Amino acid sequence: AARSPADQDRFICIYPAYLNNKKTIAEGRRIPISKAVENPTATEIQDVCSAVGLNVFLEKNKMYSREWNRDVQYRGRVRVQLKQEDGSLCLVQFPSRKSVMLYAAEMIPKLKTR
Template identity: 40%
Template structure:
């Protein structure tokens, strides 16, 4: 299935499928390597599963995640940590009509901006950040005590 393939939904309105690769919102990449947004709006090393979680939480997208695919601009395709892509289509029904009428997700760029804002708020990201900051603080305190001990000798 391609990203422009049309699928009919339950109420007869046709939906297009769009694809999001994690490289589209990665701050560590340049525009040439595939980043689509400004660095200030992007996230460091997003994963396709995180993008999937954000889109599924809205309940107005039909989401499919494929972890075996690789972005075409990747140089070393065997050692990639952020593999895969997320394919999504907007579901048009009575429950999601408010979101659609508000023009919140008119185009792919608005969806990318929303995903980039919401990924840092995921529980998996906050747990990782607190563990890293805790280990960094303990390393800093150890290095400070080592410096003090060296001065005393």
């Protein structure tokens, strides 16, 4: 099958819960509370990531397994390409999933819309 890091099925995943400052680690938060943000949405994540030059796409209706509430506000997952077909980084600034999460968390509060 098509399994290089440039194939969409191998893009990394970011769910809103990973950056939410009101969730515990058990609930899915992946970055420190100090750096996390309030109520991040998948759309805001897509926007800040796309703005910095990352190839990303939004799956608006995918839901996070640790979240029992299926309402639209809890939905959305962003897929991010980290590496090229040959395995090298798309952007030196983003060597990892963590690097992308911290970046989005940093930018989202700066959205004119917030």
